[PDB]
Scaffold this active site. Structure first.
Site, PDB file in Angstrom:
ATOM      1  N   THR A 118       8.861 -53.207  19.417  1.00 43.57           N
ATOM      2  CA  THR A 118       9.142 -54.144  20.522  1.00 43.57           C
ATOM      3  C   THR A 118       9.180 -55.624  20.104  1.00 43.57           C
ATOM      4  O   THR A 118       9.494 -56.497  20.933  1.00 43.57           O
ATOM      5  CB  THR A 118       8.166 -53.984  21.726  1.00 43.57           C
ATOM      6  OG1 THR A 118       6.809 -54.079  21.274  1.00 43.57           O
ATOM      7  CG2 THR A 118       8.284 -52.608  22.368  1.00 43.57           C
ATOM      8  N   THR A 137       3.058 -54.180  17.667  1.00 48.96           N
ATOM      9  CA  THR A 137       4.402 -54.572  18.150  1.00 48.96           C
ATOM     10  C   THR A 137       5.540 -54.147  17.212  1.00 48.96           C
ATOM     11  O   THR A 137       6.595 -54.774  17.204  1.00 48.96           O
ATOM     12  CB  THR A 137       4.524 -56.125  18.408  1.00 48.96           C
ATOM     13  OG1 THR A 137       4.313 -56.859  17.192  1.00 48.96           O
ATOM     14  CG2 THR A 137       3.435 -56.634  19.296  1.00 48.96           C
ATOM     15  N   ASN A 172      -8.384 -46.183  18.258  1.00 45.35           N
ATOM     16  CA  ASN A 172      -7.177 -45.411  18.465  1.00 45.35           C
ATOM     17  C   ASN A 172      -6.348 -45.400  17.189  1.00 45.35           C
ATOM     18  O   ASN A 172      -6.812 -45.822  16.130  1.00 45.35           O
ATOM     19  CB  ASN A 172      -6.367 -46.021  19.621  1.00 45.35           C
ATOM     20  CG  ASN A 172      -5.743 -47.392  19.259  1.00 45.35           C
ATOM     21  OD1 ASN A 172      -6.435 -48.293  18.770  1.00 45.35           O
ATOM     22  ND2 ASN A 172      -4.437 -47.535  19.477  1.00 45.35           N
ATOM     23  N   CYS A 197      -3.928 -47.281  16.155  1.00 46.03           N
ATOM     24  CA  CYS A 197      -3.638 -48.576  15.499  1.00 46.03           C
ATOM     25  C   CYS A 197      -4.778 -49.549  15.553  1.00 46.03           C
ATOM     26  O   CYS A 197      -4.592 -50.755  15.388  1.00 46.03           O
ATOM     27  CB  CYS A 197      -2.419 -49.230  16.092  1.00 46.03           C
ATOM     28  SG  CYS A 197      -1.001 -48.174  15.980  1.00 46.03           S
ATOM     29  N   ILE A 226     -15.726 -23.038  17.975  1.00 46.76           N
ATOM     30  CA  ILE A 226     -14.322 -22.684  17.792  1.00 46.76           C
ATOM     31  C   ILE A 226     -13.548 -22.873  19.106  1.00 46.76           C
ATOM     32  O   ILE A 226     -12.360 -23.199  19.106  1.00 46.76           O
ATOM     33  CB  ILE A 226     -14.175 -21.261  17.199  1.00 46.76           C
ATOM     34  CG1 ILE A 226     -14.507 -21.264  15.704  1.00 46.76           C
ATOM     35  CG2 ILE A 226     -12.757 -20.731  17.368  1.00 46.76           C
ATOM     36  CD1 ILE A 226     -13.517 -22.018  14.814  1.00 46.76           C
ATOM     37  N   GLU A 255      -6.614 -50.977  17.799  1.00 41.65           N
ATOM     38  CA  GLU A 255      -6.683 -52.094  18.717  1.00 41.65           C
ATOM     39  C   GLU A 255      -7.492 -51.767  19.986  1.00 41.65           C
ATOM     40  O   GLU A 255      -8.169 -52.627  20.549  1.00 41.65           O
ATOM     41  CB  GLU A 255      -5.280 -52.619  19.024  1.00 41.65           C
ATOM     42  CG  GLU A 255      -4.486 -51.876  20.099  1.00 41.65           C
ATOM     43  CD  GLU A 255      -3.596 -50.743  19.600  1.00 41.65           C
ATOM     44  OE1 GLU A 255      -2.561 -50.514  20.232  1.00 41.65           O
ATOM     45  OE2 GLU A 255      -3.921 -50.039  18.625  1.00 41.65           O
TER      46      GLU A 255
HETATM   47  N1  LIG Z   1     -15.352 -17.240  11.816  1.00 40.10           N
HETATM   48  C1  LIG Z   1     -15.430 -18.579  11.570  1.00 40.10           C
HETATM   49  N2  LIG Z   1     -14.649 -19.151  10.631  1.00 40.10           N
HETATM   50  C2  LIG Z   1     -14.679 -20.471  10.361  1.00 40.10           C
HETATM   51  N3  LIG Z   1     -15.488 -21.354  10.968  1.00 40.10           N
HETATM   52  C3  LIG Z   1     -16.349 -20.946  11.935  1.00 40.10           C
HETATM   53  C4  LIG Z   1     -16.361 -19.497  12.294  1.00 40.10           C
HETATM   54  N4  LIG Z   1     -17.295 -19.361  13.258  1.00 40.10           N
HETATM   55  C5  LIG Z   1     -17.814 -20.602  13.506  1.00 40.10           C
HETATM   56  N5  LIG Z   1     -17.259 -21.559  12.720  1.00 40.10           N
HETATM   57  C6  LIG Z   1     -17.621 -23.009  12.753  1.00 40.10           C
HETATM   58  O1  LIG Z   1     -18.998 -23.151  13.072  1.00 40.10           O
HETATM   59  C7  LIG Z   1     -19.224 -24.076  14.135  1.00 40.10           C
HETATM   60  C8  LIG Z   1     -19.836 -23.326  15.299  1.00 40.10           C
HETATM   61  O2  LIG Z   1     -18.859 -22.501  15.906  1.00 40.10           O
HETATM   62  P1  LIG Z   1     -19.243 -21.708  17.243  1.00 40.10           P
HETATM   63  O3  LIG Z   1     -18.018 -20.880  17.550  1.00 40.10           O
HETATM   64  O4  LIG Z   1     -19.929 -22.617  18.255  1.00 40.10           O
HETATM   65  O5  LIG Z   1     -20.405 -20.851  16.576  1.00 40.10           O
HETATM   66  P2  LIG Z   1     -21.304 -19.803  17.363  1.00 40.10           P
HETATM   67  O6  LIG Z   1     -20.838 -18.434  16.966  1.00 40.10           O
HETATM   68  O7  LIG Z   1     -21.356 -20.121  18.832  1.00 40.10           O
HETATM   69  N6  LIG Z   1     -22.694 -20.058  16.542  1.00 40.10           N
HETATM   70  P3  LIG Z   1     -23.596 -21.402  16.686  1.00 40.10           P
HETATM   71  O8  LIG Z   1     -22.600 -22.434  17.175  1.00 40.10           O
HETATM   72  O9  LIG Z   1     -24.099 -21.584  15.277  1.00 40.10           O
HETATM   73  O10 LIG Z   1     -24.689 -21.106  17.706  1.00 40.10           O
HETATM   74  C9  LIG Z   1     -17.910 -24.725  14.498  1.00 40.10           C
HETATM   75  O11 LIG Z   1     -17.820 -26.055  13.924  1.00 40.10           O
HETATM   76  C10 LIG Z   1     -16.928 -23.737  13.896  1.00 40.10           C
HETATM   77  O12 LIG Z   1     -15.857 -24.486  13.364  1.00 40.10           O
HETATM   78  O1  LIG Z   2       4.454 -45.311  15.255  1.00 42.31           O
HETATM   79  C1  LIG Z   2       3.711 -45.444  16.234  1.00 42.31           C
HETATM   80  C2  LIG Z   2       3.237 -46.710  16.557  1.00 42.31           C
HETATM   81  C3  LIG Z   2       2.427 -46.844  17.618  1.00 42.31           C
HETATM   82  N1  LIG Z   2       2.042 -45.819  18.444  1.00 42.31           N
HETATM   83  C4  LIG Z   2       1.124 -46.109  19.595  1.00 42.31           C
HETATM   84  O2  LIG Z   2       1.426 -47.364  20.207  1.00 42.31           O
HETATM   85  C5  LIG Z   2       0.363 -48.305  20.066  1.00 42.31           C
HETATM   86  C6  LIG Z   2       0.889 -49.657  19.587  1.00 42.31           C
HETATM   87  O3  LIG Z   2       2.082 -49.458  18.859  1.00 42.31           O
HETATM   88  P1  LIG Z   2       3.151 -50.615  18.520  1.00 42.31           P
HETATM   89  O4  LIG Z   2       2.795 -51.899  19.180  1.00 42.31           O
HETATM   90  O5  LIG Z   2       3.297 -50.738  17.038  1.00 42.31           O
HETATM   91  O6  LIG Z   2       4.515 -49.989  19.128  1.00 42.31           O
HETATM   92  P2  LIG Z   2       5.500 -50.610  20.251  1.00 42.31           P
HETATM   93  O7  LIG Z   2       4.820 -50.522  21.559  1.00 42.31           O
HETATM   94  O8  LIG Z   2       5.835 -52.014  19.897  1.00 42.31           O
HETATM   95  O9  LIG Z   2       6.763 -49.837  20.234  1.00 42.31           O
HETATM   96  C7  LIG Z   2      -0.617 -47.690  19.074  1.00 42.31           C
HETATM   97  O10 LIG Z   2      -1.958 -48.049  19.343  1.00 42.31           O
HETATM   98  C8  LIG Z   2      -0.344 -46.193  19.147  1.00 42.31           C
HETATM   99  O11 LIG Z   2      -1.222 -45.558  20.058  1.00 42.31           O
HETATM  100  C9  LIG Z   2       2.506 -44.524  18.141  1.00 42.31           C
HETATM  101  O12 LIG Z   2       2.209 -43.528  18.827  1.00 42.31           O
HETATM  102  N2  LIG Z   2       3.343 -44.357  17.031  1.00 42.31           N
END
Ligand SMILES: Nc1ncnc2c1ncn2[C@@H]1O[C@H](COP(=O)(O)OP(=O)(O)NP(=O)(O)O)[C@@H](O)[C@H]1O
Ligand SMILES: O=c1ccn([C@@H]2O[C@H](COP(=O)(O)OP(=O)(O)O)[C@@H](O)[C@H]2O)c(=O)[nH]1
Ligand SMILES: Nc1ncnc2c1ncn2[C@@H]1O[C@H](COP(=O)(O)OP(=O)(O)NP(=O)(O)O)[C@@H](O)[C@H]1O
Ligand SMILES: O=c1ccn([C@@H]2O[C@H](COP(=O)(O)OP(=O)(O)O)[C@@H](O)[C@H]2O)c(=O)[nH]1
Ligand SMILES: [Mg+2]
Ligand SMILES: [Mg+2]
Lengths: 651, 651
Positions: free
Chosen positions: A523, A520, A338, A340, A140, A342
């Site tokens: 741009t 693009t 990412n 898009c 968490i 690329e």
């Molecule tokens: N109270 C909670 N509600 C919802 N999801 C939870 C809860 N506690 C843990 N999780 C999920 O369980 C996973 C482990 O969470 P973490 O907080 O590391 O657990 P922990 O208590 O340290 N136990 P563990 O990780 O099993 O040794 C994560 O992917 C959390 O999203």
């Molecule tokens: O709506 C958008 C489009 C693009 N991107 C980011 O910009 C990169 C390329 O976007 P694009 O070439 O279409 O945008 P431009 O640079 O031409 O404005 C992507 O990999 C994204 O990380 C974004 O944050 N929102």
């Protein structure tokens, strides 16, 4: 209706104060203000305001709408001022390079991605477009730390790709309680909610992150369905984009009509921290050990296709093709692309990968200059300009303001850069070359080889001045293995690769990566050319303008009339099967839906060997069908594409 | 169908392994396991398993449903085992105190709040019920850090009260962008979303936080409306509870039918970090300076009432009454209450206030023992038992596992504790005293004086052994100013306050606070008595059981029949205006809706002078109306109540 002298415009911008609040809100940086004042004569007289008439009506209104800086909702910067500010923001004290970048950009040889255009030369220079983030830990604390990070990143320009393979799936065990985990979806719903709460840059459009899961994760079925406009509501995440990070073994099980096994990452650790054979070894062992749920591969498949057909997502990016063929492989295993599809860059809990982007405008190198009235392509100017943009993007790395520490760490270690292109379709049309011609196929290969070669050379020169990037030693590059070598291919040969490889082995390169052709979207619209490397989607687009190359031709043939006007609106910008129109024109102005997707994948496969990273390959399908999609996915896969599919665009 | 020997039951619990996973999941702590084994004979033979027959059918099924520990979905702990485990978890090596706590708890003199019952003697001993959290900073970093904190707290048992007065309101300015802020609501929506994602303890019921805003915050109108089941969807936050933190000046402007002014905290800083006159001084100055939006106080009012009438929220807690009359005033200005409006404790970005809770069972001290068949109240046993629970809650502070560092910091510095009560209504009924009688009014005052006195004495003894709490110096307590002194009142006098104040001034007390009577929702149901200090809401409750005190009487009068059975279902557990039923019975079994809310506020005002902290005063209105609510709010306000209203319960 806007002050003319540039330094006067800077003055205003820099001296701005927000009246509602009484707070000084300077929009130019200290260091850039000083530069400007210290060089007011050179700088003021270097601008050429005719160049403002290079912009189409739509081009300019894009600039006006959200690019040129405003003082109290009123545009205070002329396009040339925007450019000059950009060139300064990138080049600082180096006035010559500044002045160089200014001319080329004003002449529309190339442009920088939107973050750069927005923030260069401003106090919070966040000129980066891409962040690939690692889910910090399956806890968490880890989840909320990453959440905190995405929010801080979202505060400024730039899209996020986030990978979440390490998160415990539905019903998985948790030490310390009898409660059991809820899986990715509830958590996705948290990210989604943060995406909508944090404005990007400070405006209208929502956050949007892309999410990267490997298809064996036990929550896959729901994950891929995140964008459906029905079903329930609380199972969806409609502001995020699912992206499959697919390993070959999956494609194989699908093909062989075999089985696939879903694991929770905790029952089957290490799956995402390896690739190729080691992965299959590990995966098959886990399968034998009965740690997962087995189902028929083709059932997952068929679901994946239903989603793409309906939502155009998830995107597909081949994990193995990405890792086998990355210059970053020495850093460790790349876990995502990412937003898009690329960028292909390493990321970790302490390293959030970044990238800066510019786009060369390919039409600008057509010169109908020899004698008569053939055109040629000036690949020498393309090399030159490509070198300049390399130097620019590199300068941006240093002068950039990073939104979080994991981004600054990542960028200063590896210095990846991203070049791409706009107006391929234009170059083709201007050159009388059908997109699917053997001539256009030759030109693609050529253009891209020359950009790769150029940027690698320019980066080599940099390494020579400022040293190689910190992690150069151990790289495929440092062993003489460049992009196309990792495709087991020989380069086209238009440039001298022996000498370059020789130098690279000697001195290194400044950047770990250089090429990642992008969408693009905005741009290309500023400059007035078609999106990146894709063909036109229509000859009519939309307040409706006919393709100027088409239109020109229709007039010289004295066939443009009312029926020709209205036919184009009827047939949504298509000129095929239209009575009085030559075959030459029909071949030249095929829309994208009229070109074989096999040809697209081919040309994508062709330029891919000169691409360090990946490119945003959109797929277009007219009459969509399971089997038809299936052959387009597999075709690309076997070509060894990294980004098998960005959006499935349809209708 | 459950092992009998206690140490054998511990053995199983402690040796447990989760079969699905092959992971050892011990449910007893190391240190408690050792204790148990090291004292198996004493411990095993001290249990009295008849005492399991103290629990009603509903009492037991509450214990069974979610309290007694299970091994593979099967209950493995007898109620006595639960108790013994609790007494050990609290008392560790001190077997005598352990053994003392065991007898009293098994005999139902008192019980500990649910977190204690759940986790005492388990490896993650989180025995705390309350966390009051401070919004860290008006930044995206501060917001997400607090969000992270609430999530980490929510992972385990215990409700949150969160104050957010420092957050920038809608449309407020942000340096670095032209974007403008979105206010509390979008942000509330983020908290809400986290509340639903993080299970409490690991089960069914949702997160629920309470949110504390001062009524001058510019987003107040929407904030108060967070719980409406209509309007839109994206303006609501339906898993959180709005709580008004009201300053007197507001009540004044409302009364005088004057104006109120809404500020964003950034246009008007410091508003929440002061109270009483300094606040009015600062507020009035800001008003003069035109930093806000002025409107008619009574328009905000009228909205506040609409919300309460429909949702029973926001709660009302008087900021000034809380700060003027807190023993924690030396620490700084208290900014919120908690989820159930009983805790009044200082919190800051680095100090998240905590509290442990137990409830004395007031009926247990009725002894019909003199001679004939009058009953008396054994206030000597009440004092004794009240002292024990004080020592317990104090032990819990040290042995508690804190979910976050800001909680451990806060608790170890000030050691606040929380005593309260259940079965007031029972005591009254058993003693033949109508809730609204001058006799019942006397008893209330008396019971509460004796608990306050007891716990203060027991804490004094502690200070003598382990030193005063770190921040004792400078406290009202250290100056001889106890709770009722801050009400400018003399104590009832049943106990010797001079001697106690004398000792307190000499040696200090271990705990900064001691008394905060709480809702007892589930721990009153285990013991089989009515909620805390409120009157019965019905004589029939619901699979439908008639009030045993009523029922008993109806039989001795030979008037209980079919008509009397069915009348009670018709008239929803009311015996008023019912033909053959004596006035004595009618007065004694008035439902809560049949008692004047003026009387309730009176008795609340009466016991409040012996309450360190606050108490969860629910208001009940039969025929709800603007004016009627208005006189109940103002009546309580003028009485100097802290918690003017918890829920407005209606129909
Ligand atoms: N109270 C909670 N509600 C919802 N999801 C939870 C809860 N506690 C843990 N999780 C999920 O369980 C996973 C482990 O969470 P973490 O907080 O590391 O657990 P922990 O208590 O340290 N136990 P563990 O990780 O099993 O040794 C994560 O992917 C959390 O999203
Ligand atoms: O709506 C958008 C489009 C693009 N991107 C980011 O910009 C990169 C390329 O976007 P694009 O070439 O279409 O945008 P431009 O640079 O031409 O404005 C992507 O990999 C994204 O990380 C974004 O944050 N929102
Ligand atoms: N991109 C954004 N989207 C939504 N809300 C934002 C954004 N940026 C800031 N805020 C809100 O504005 C307030 C200030 O945020 P913070 O991150 O401290 O701003 P900052 O950039 O440091 N500027 P400032 O605080 O004005 O000096 C907080 O209450 C945030 O909730
Ligand atoms: O549904 C609930 C009720 C209460 N509480 C917390 O427990 C305290 C008192 O709760 P109550 O007496 O009603 O519960 P009990 O201890 O009897 O189980 C509150 O101030 C809350 O902080 C909670 O987290 N959820
Ligand atoms: Mg963990
Ligand atoms: Mg700030």
């Amino acid at each position: 209706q806007t002050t003319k002298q540039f330094s006067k415009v800077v003055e205003d911008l820099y001296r701005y104060v927000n009246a509602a609040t009484g707070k000084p809100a300077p929009m130019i940086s200290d260091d850039v203000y000083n530069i400007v004042m210290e060089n007011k004569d050179k700088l003021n007289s270097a601008i050429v305001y005719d160049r403002d008439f290079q912009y189409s009506y739509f081009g300019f209104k894009t600039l006006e709408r959200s690019y040129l800086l405003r003082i109290n909702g009123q545009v205070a910067e002329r396009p040339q001022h925007l450019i000059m500010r950009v060139a300064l923001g990138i080049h600082g004290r180096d006035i010559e390079a500044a002045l160089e970048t200014y001319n080329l950009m004003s002449l529309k040889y190339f442009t920088h991605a939107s973050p750069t255009l927005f923030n260069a030369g401003t106090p919070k220079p966040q000129m980066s477009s891409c962040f690939l983030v690692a889910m910090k830990e399956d806890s968490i604390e880890g989840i909320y730390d990453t959440l905190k990070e995405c929010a801080l990143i979202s505060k400024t320009a730039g899209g996020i790709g986030l990978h979440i393979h390490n998160i415990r799936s539905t019903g998985s065990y948790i030490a310390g309680t009898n409660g059991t985990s809820n899986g990715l979806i509830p958590m996705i719903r948290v990210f989604n909610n943060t995406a909508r709460y944090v404005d990007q840059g400070g405006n209208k459009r929502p956050g949007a992150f892309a999410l990267y899961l490997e298809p064996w994760h036990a929550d896959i079925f729901d994950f891929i369905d995140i964008r459906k406009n029905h079903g329930k509501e609380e199972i969806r995440a409609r502001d995020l984009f699912p992206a499959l990070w697919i390993p070959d073994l999956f494609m194989k099980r699908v093909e062989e009509n075999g089985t696939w096994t879903l694991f929770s990452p905790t029952s089957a650790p290490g799956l995402s921290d390896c690739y190729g054979d080691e992965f299959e070894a590990l995966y098959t062992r886990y399968e034998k050990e009965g740690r997962g749920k087995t189902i028929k591969a083709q059932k997952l498949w068929y679901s994946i296709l239903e989603a793409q057909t309906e939502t155009g997502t998830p995107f597909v990016v081949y994990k193995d093709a990405c890792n086998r063929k990355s210059n970053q492989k020495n850093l460790g295993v790349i876990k995502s692309s990412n937003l898009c599809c690329e960028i292909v860059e390493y990321s970790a809990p302490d390293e959030t990968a970044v990238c800066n982007l510019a786009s060369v405008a390919l039409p600008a190198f057509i010169e109908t200059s020899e004698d008569g009235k053939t055109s040629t392509y000036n690949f020498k100017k393309l090399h030159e300009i490509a070198k300049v943009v390399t130097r620019n993007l590199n300068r941006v790395i240093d002068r950039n303001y990073y939104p979080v520490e994991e981004a600054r760490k990542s960028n200063m270690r590896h210095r990846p850069i991203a070049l791409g292109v706009q107006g391929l379709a234009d170059t083709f049309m201007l050159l009388r070359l059908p997109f699917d011609s053997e001539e256009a196929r030759l030109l693609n290969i050529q253009i891209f080889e020359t950009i790769y070669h150029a940027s690698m050379e320019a980066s080599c020169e940099l390494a020579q001045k400022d040293g190689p990037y910190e992690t150069f030693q151990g790289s495929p590059a440092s062993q003489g293995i460049l992009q196309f070598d990792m495709w087991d291919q020989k380069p086209y040969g238009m440039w001298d690769w022996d000498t370059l490889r020789k130098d690279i082995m000697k001195h290194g390169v400044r950047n770990s990566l250089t090429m990642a052709p992008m969408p693009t979207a905005s741009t290309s619209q500023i400059l007035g050319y078609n999106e990146c490397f894709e063909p036109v989607t229509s000859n009519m687009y939309s307040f409706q303008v006919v393709n100027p190359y088409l239109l020109r031709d229709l007039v010289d043939l004295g066939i443009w009339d009312e029926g020709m006007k209205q036919y184009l609106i009827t047939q949504n910008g298509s000129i095929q099967g239209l009575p009085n129109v030559p075959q030459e024109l029909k071949d030249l102005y095929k829309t994208v839906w009229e070109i074989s997707q096999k040809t697209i994948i081919n040309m994508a496969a062709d330029r891919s060997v000169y691409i360090d990273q990946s490119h945003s390959l959109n797929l277009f399908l007219r009459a969509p069908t399971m089997g038809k999609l299936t052959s387009m996915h597999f075709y690309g896969w076997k070509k060894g594409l990294k980004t098998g599919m960005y959006y499935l665009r349809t209708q």
